[PDB]
């Protein structure tokens, strides 16, 4: 399915499987890194760096 910004507030969307439940979890996300941008998906292991650092990497990959 395709959901919108206002339609997403009234529905449960698991990220990983085994997070899906029976009554809860109406939907599920395609990939776990769907939340991140195209450039933020080019940073390696962004999960183990602190966040202000991933914001500077995004701005430094464009210079």
């Amino acid at each position: 399915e395709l959901i919108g910004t206002m339609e997403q507030i009234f529905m449960n969307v698991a990220i990983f499987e085994d997070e899906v439940f029976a009554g809860v979890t109406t939907h599920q996300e395609l990939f776990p890194h769907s939340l991140l941008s195209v450039i933020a998906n080019f940073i390696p292991f962004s999960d183990h760096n602190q966040s202000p650092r991933n914001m500077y990497q995004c701005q430094m990959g464009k210079q």
Binding site: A14, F16, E17, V20, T25, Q28
Partner: protein
């Protein structure tokens, strides 16, 4: 010979067309979960010391 108001209706029927729910199967993903990165079998050292 004209039209006059008749007795008030005693009830109302509202019709709509509706289909039903299937069983909950919840088939989340073709190849599901985040499959883990892993070791290539055997591998072997690709480097040796001198001497």
């Amino acid at each position: 010979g004209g039209l006059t108001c008749a007795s008030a209706p005693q009830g109302t029927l509202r019709i709509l067309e509706g289909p039903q729910q299937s069983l909950s199967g919840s088939p989340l993903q073709p190849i599901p979960a985040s499959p883990p990165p892993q070791i290539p079998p055997g591998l072997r050292p690709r480097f040796c010391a001198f001497g």
